Design a protein around this nucleic acid. Structure first.
Ligand SMILES: [Mg+2]
Ligand SMILES: [Mg+2]
Ligand SMILES: [Mg+2]
Ligand SMILES: [Mg+2]
Ligand SMILES: [Mg+2]
Ligand SMILES: [Mg+2]
Ligand SMILES: [Mg+2]
Ligand SMILES: [Mg+2]
Ligand SMILES: [Mg+2]
Ligand SMILES: [Mg+2]
Ligand SMILES: [Mg+2]
Ligand SMILES: [Mg+2]
Ligand SMILES: [Mg+2]
Ligand SMILES: [Mg+2]
Ligand SMILES: [Mg+2]
Ligand SMILES: [Mg+2]
Ligand SMILES: [Mg+2]
Ligand SMILES: [Mg+2]
Ligand SMILES: [Mg+2]
Ligand SMILES: [Mg+2]
Ligand SMILES: [Mg+2]
Ligand SMILES: [Mg+2]
Ligand SMILES: [Mg+2]
Ligand SMILES: [Mg+2]
Ligand SMILES: [Mg+2]
Ligand SMILES: [Mg+2]
Ligand SMILES: [Mg+2]
Lengths: 51, 180, 134, 126, 51, 148, 125, 103, 51
RNA sequence: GAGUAGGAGGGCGUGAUCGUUGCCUAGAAGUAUUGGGCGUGAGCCUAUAUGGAGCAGCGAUUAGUGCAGAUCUUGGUGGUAG
RNA sequence: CUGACCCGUCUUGAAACACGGACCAAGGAGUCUAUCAAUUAAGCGAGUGAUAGGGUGGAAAAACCCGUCCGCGAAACGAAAG
RNA sequence: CACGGGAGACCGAUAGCGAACAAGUACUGCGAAGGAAAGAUGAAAAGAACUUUGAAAAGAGGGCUAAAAGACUUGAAACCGUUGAGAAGGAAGCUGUAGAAGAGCAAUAAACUGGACGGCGCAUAAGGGGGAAGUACUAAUCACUGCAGAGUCGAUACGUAAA
């Protein structure tokens, strides 16, 4: 028999972000990429890496 | 068995909202003012804490014109601190010399306050300057919003000046004689 | 920093293992296995790593601040010392690097336990090479 | 991978494989050439034939060498002389083998073969 | 990172003096606290004199 | 989304917080579908939160064309905010000739006075002016010019 | 063999809290559930009935999560976890996962004896 | 129908199930347009992409202040240019015969 | 916010800093806000889905 | 320190997705347990047996996410009863 | 030894001489789209934000840049002339 | 919709199209029309040689195979048989409290830390010089802030009829 809520195609999956927040995000990301504690905290292996 | 209201478990509504924001920095600024509040007997800091824990919406705008309008002879030398975002009023022509401390300066408010010979301050700085809040001026912005007009009294009770929720404003919309 | 990094990694650290709501850390420099500002070596300043080598030698790793220098002393994570005196040497080193009482206690713990550990390990490696030969 | 028209779906491929028509199957079941032959024709792999000489590389039967009795493409089997097992009643039966576990010691030579080999070598070295 | 990479980084984004080129008016986030060490701030003269 | 929703915390409570007596039922309970019975059992609603909903107002427009009714308004206070700072300062010091501000190019048509103006003189080019707009403009040492 | 200090461990209730009428049915397992029934005996605290799961029952904070062997229980998933027990050796005991193979088991047992760590699931022959 | 909220405006009153529009083609479509444009360039190579467009004022009182791209040149204009419609067309110029110059 | 000069390393050699030292871009200055990374990341992941 | 209708705050357990840490022919999942334990409780960990290829934790993302009932659906079985 | 009526349900009132349930497995019920509002976290602020579309781009429907208009706010009161 | 291509935070044999299969099939209906159930031995049939008792099915021996996995992967519950340990004078089950019997590779237990000394094997100690790296200071240098000459890029309701 048919479902409870037969699931549709037009369920809206995609979302749209304000540009400024996309950017702020990318930024803060880059900012993060620069500190040893963080990239090490991510599990990357930076031991023999220098600067 | 005892007849106490709410069983002595009465919740205290007199308290400071525990803030859920995620900027790590708000939480930190807040660590700071928790310190200043318990270890400093200065009302000013406690005040700053209450208002910095504000609902996102409960933080209200400071405009350059707002500051300008509230200025006394002594208000001028004094550090101006708003608990909120400070914004430019485009209709303010000349901008005084100011040392202002807020959470956020609209880049316009910043440009004009700086290019007028002013200084922009952040609360970690304020801490360092005057923890007691000595010679500081704390600006509480005026509270306005559209929501407020739908609140109050209901829309069409006797003497209700409150606004109805309507999808369009037209001659045809809740502007016609009701059923009286 | 140790503050900002706390808030940042307190929950998502890759060195993190949980047991019944008790959060422990895999950090090599952890002064206590448990996940806390203090437990977390890659965060704040005081952290130590210790490895056995060449029969007494303890490799001491002194958590060292992030450095842009002319020469590269060791891993960006930390500083690396070979100590031949080991236990005593490292005990001193600790005493220097950990000023507060607790941190001292903990590091030292890491030591005693570490050492006796490395001793057993030695015994076993011995028996192992004598097993490969005979 | 570089090309949108290349199916990466398990389904599609498995399908291609098992739905393989005979001629394509022969390709699909193929063996690796001996160091010597590799060197001779400049060709790594070759599709197996019923007259070839092969060496079983992997299995309880690894190490044994012999002629290919039957290429039974439907059963997916290659049969090799003396690779049979004996049954208690005194009855012999062949043991089937997967080509990609074989190695080609000596090819059955003839014009078509040589042409194929030639094309492969051609794109290879050039 | 590359050289071209690393250098274009700034032109693309910009800095608290200037806007970005590629983002055409993007201003990076204005920090909430100049100094993120509450250590420094709780532990300085001004603080403790009053405390 | 889903794991935030009430359902999850309602599972096994049997009424789904719709009540044991009054449970969750079809349109009959809604009071009829949509704006149903607004004038009757829903009187109180309509009257109270949408008073003046039922009825008629004054004059039908058969085809209403908005484009020609289009008239953005400006107030005196924002005038100098339209043109750059360069301008108003440079003609505060220089009294030889006076500034012309075209409200038109800014996308506005009528000028209403709202705030007050600097004592420095201006010319303002606009489609319409309010008695007070002109008042304050002229009194400032300024002039009103009619555009199309 | 590294016990620490105990307050005497006191267990408020031993018998598990059995779901009501679950002895009556197969379809009903005994995993507790809170009766919402309108007539329900239990939900009503009828003299003689089960006392349903309550907070007054939670064991005291000091003994909570304490094994009978005296240690708090720590679960070994990968090898790494072992090492953590080092700074924690006297507080916790090791428990090696069921998914970990025989070889790696002996390995971790060795490593444990070395790090001086107590193992509840340790292989005794 | 319960609270103070604004009177709803029915949407799904008819059978909309037959009448829904889906936008996934959009992704590929944009792309297609690109290639089309590009393949135009290549096939037109020596010549320009968009044909010559005159300009006019917009048709509404509010739009007058702005500038807009016309569909074609006024015969009057081609005259003052000294081109025949036909020729201008062989050139890549866009002509519009119903437009008239009042200024 | 530190903006130390960063050395541009040489590939041909295990550890060699080229003669080029470059002052750090503001992107790496940018505050590390995780909120913004969170939201944005979420939505952008969602953008890949087929219905 | 009561509580139905109802509401709020925390937590348990299940797919799949982006991460992160790992386990498995030296035996994964699943299954049985009068083996040993952990939670007040959702539930958990282990042991033994069976099994013979895949699994698991942690942070998030998402949900066709938890059943004793509806003369509930489909399937399988009783007592009546030799 | 002391205590212990059958659960679910509707009901002022259920162990009821009220109804459903002989047993077991698996399935099984507030979703999806739109709309306004209140609250919470985000960004920017007299502004804000695009959509369509252009332009680039990973194998890839992502992403990244552009996007003269438009929305909503920025002025209200009038049936309307205003 | 048809034949093609590729794909998916779909479904995964009571799900997913009704149909993973001789599925719009078997079957029903005068007819229009209705319409299911049903997928997994093994790597390879090596699908159980042979002995024995049977009229025959089949049993007992014996064998294949990593294993019978043998009409077939795993093999839960309800229900049923066997074996074990219990119990019962017109029903059963259950909270609280003790006891008895039965079943057991046992989960708890007088151990642990140190001083001095001894017997063993390994390492090299503290203290003193020394002082790489580290931190702190501090001139000379130098990121950053500030000031800021020349070149190149940009903007500009400053300015011009444009320049
Ligand atoms: Mg009481
Ligand atoms: Mg009106
Ligand atoms: Mg190849
Ligand atoms: Mg909720
Ligand atoms: Mg409830
Ligand atoms: Mg218990
Ligand atoms: Mg098309
Ligand atoms: Mg699913
Ligand atoms: Mg085995
Ligand atoms: Mg868990
Ligand atoms: Mg086995
Ligand atoms: Mg989760
Ligand atoms: Mg179920
Ligand atoms: Mg059931
Ligand atoms: Mg029957
Ligand atoms: Mg009794
Ligand atoms: Mg019953
Ligand atoms: Mg009666
Ligand atoms: Mg009834
Ligand atoms: Mg778009
Ligand atoms: Mg408007
Ligand atoms: Mg037999
Ligand atoms: Mg078996
Ligand atoms: Mg039985
Ligand atoms: Mg008996
Ligand atoms: Mg009995
Ligand atoms: Mg008896």
């Amino acid at each position: 028999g048919r479902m409870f809520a037969p699931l549709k195609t037009y369920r809206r999956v995609h979302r749209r972000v304000n540009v400024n927040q996309k950017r702020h995000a990318v930024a803060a990301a880059l900012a993060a990429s620069a500190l040893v504690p963080l990239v090490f905290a991510r599990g990357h292996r930076i031991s023999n890496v220098q600067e | 068995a005892i007849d106490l209201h709410k069983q002595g478990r009465v919740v205290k509504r007199s308290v400071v909202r525990q803030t859920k924001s995620t900027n790590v920095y708000h939480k930190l600024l807040i660590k700071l003012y928790k310190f200043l509040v318990r270890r400093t007997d200065s009302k000013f800091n406690q005040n700053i804490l209450k208002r910095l824990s504000s609902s996102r919406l409960n933080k209200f705008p400071l405009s350059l014109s707002r500051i300008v309008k509230n200025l006394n002879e002594t208000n001028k030398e004094q550090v101006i601190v708003s608990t909120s975002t400070v914004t430019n009023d485009e209709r303010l022509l000349t901008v005084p010399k100011l040392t202002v401390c807020a959470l956020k300066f609209t880049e316009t408010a910043r440009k004009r306050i700086l290019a007028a010979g002013g200084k922009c301050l952040t609360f970690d700085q304020l801490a360092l300057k005057a923890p007691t809040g000595t010679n500081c001026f704390l600006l509480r912005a005026p509270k306005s919003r559209e929501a407020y007009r739908h609140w109050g009294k209901a829309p069409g009770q006797r003497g209700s000046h409150s606004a109805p929720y309507v999808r369009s404003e037209g001659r045809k919309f809740e502007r016609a004689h009701g059923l009286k | 920093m140790s503050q900002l990094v706390w808030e940042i990694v307190k929950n998502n650290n890759a060195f993190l293992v949980k047991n019944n709501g008790v959060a422990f850390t895999t950090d090599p420099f952890s002064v206590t296995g448990r996940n806390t500002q203090v437990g977390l070596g890659f965060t704040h300043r005081h952290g130590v790593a210790l490895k056995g080598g060449a029969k007494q030698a303890i490799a001491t790793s002194l958590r060292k601040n992030q450095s842009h220098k002319v020469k590269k002393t060791g891993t960006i994570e930390a500083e690396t010392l070979t100590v031949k005196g080991g236990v005593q040497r490292v005990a001193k080193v600790i005493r220097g690097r950990f000023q507060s009482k607790g941190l001292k206690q903990f590091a030292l713990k890491k030591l005693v336990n570490f050492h006796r550990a490395n001793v057993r390990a030695q015994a076993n490696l011995k028996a192992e090479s004598k097993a490969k030969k005979n | 991978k570089t090309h949108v028209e290349v199916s990466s779906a398990r389904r599609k491929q498995r399908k291609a494989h098992f739905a393989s028509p005979s001629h394509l199957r022969q390709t699909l079941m193929s063996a690796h050439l001996s160091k010597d032959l590799r060197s001779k024709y400049n060709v790594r792999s070759m599709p197996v034939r019923k007259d070839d000489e092969v060496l079983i590389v992997r299995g309880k039967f690894k190490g044994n060498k012999g002629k290919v009795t039957q290429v039974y493409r439907k059963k997916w089997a290659i049969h090799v002389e003396k690779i049979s097992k004996n049954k208690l009643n005194g009855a012999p039966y062949q043991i089937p083998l997967s080509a990609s576990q074989l190695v080609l010691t000596k090819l059955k030579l003839d014009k078509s073969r040589q042409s194929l080999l030639t094309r492969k070598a051609a794109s290879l070295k050039t | 990172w590359t050289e071209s990479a690393f250098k274009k980084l700034n032109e693309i984004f910009g800095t608290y003096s200037t806007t970005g080129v590629q983002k055409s008016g993007y201003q990076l986030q204005r920090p909430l606290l100049a100094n993120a060490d509450i250590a420094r701030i709780i532990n300085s003269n001004e603080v403790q004199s009053v405390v | 989304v889903s794991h935030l929703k009430k359902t999850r915390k309602l599972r096994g409570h049997v009424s789904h917080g719709h009540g044991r007596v009054g449970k969750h039922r079809k349109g009959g309970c809604r009071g009829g579908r949509g704006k149903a019975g607004g004038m009757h059992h829903h009187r109180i609603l309509m009257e109270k939160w949408h008073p003046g909903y039922y009825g008629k107002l004054g004059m039908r427009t058969f085809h209403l064309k908005k484009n020609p009714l289009h008239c953005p308004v400006v107030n005196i206070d924002k005038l100098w905010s339209l043109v750059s700072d360069a301008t108003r300062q440079k003609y505060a010091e220089d009294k030889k000739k006076v500034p012309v501000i075209d409200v038109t190019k800014a996308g506005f048509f009528k000028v209403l006075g709202k705030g007050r103006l600097p004592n420095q003189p201006v010319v303002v080019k606009a489609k319409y002016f309010s008695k007070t707009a002109e008042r304050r403009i002229v009194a400032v040492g300024g002039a009103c010019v009619l555009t199309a | 063999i590294k016990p620490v200090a105990h307050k005497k461990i006191i267990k408020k209730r031993t018998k598990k809290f059995v779901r009501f009428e679950s002895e009556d049915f197969a379809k009903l397992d005994s995993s507790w559930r809170r009766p919402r029934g309108i007539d329900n005996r239990v939900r009503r605290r009828f003299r003689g009935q089960r006392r349903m799961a309550k907070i007054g029952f939670a064991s005291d904070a000091a003994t909570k999560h304490l094994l009978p062997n005296g240690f708090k229980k720590f679960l070994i998933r990968n090898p790494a976890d072992l090492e953590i027990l080092l700074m924690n050796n006297r507080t916790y005991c090791g428990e090696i996962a069921h998914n970990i193979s025989a070889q790696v088991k002996a390995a971790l047992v060795k490593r444990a004896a070395e790090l001086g760590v107590r193992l509840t699931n340790a292989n005794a022959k | 129908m319960k609270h103070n909220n604004q009177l709803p405006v029915a949407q799904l009153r008819k059978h909309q199930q037959f009448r829904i529009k889906t936008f996934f083609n959009q992704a590929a479509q944009k792309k297609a347009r690109l290639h089309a444009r590009r393949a135009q360039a290549a096939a037109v190579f020596p010549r320009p992409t968009e044909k010559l467009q005159p300009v006019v004022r917009k048709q509404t009182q509010r739009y007058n202040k702005s500038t807009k791209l016309g569909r074609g040149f006024t015969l009057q204009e081609l005259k003052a240019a000294g081109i025949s419609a036909a020729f201008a067309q062989s050139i890549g110029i866009k002509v519009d015969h119903r437009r008239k110059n009042r200024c | 916010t530190s903006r130390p000069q960063i050395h541009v390393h040489d590939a041909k050699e295990a550890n060699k800093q080229t003669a080029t030292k470059l002052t750090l871009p503001a992107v790496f200055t940018a505050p590390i806000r995780t909120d913004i990374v969170h939201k944005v990341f979420t939505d952008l992941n969602k953008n890949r889905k087929q219905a």
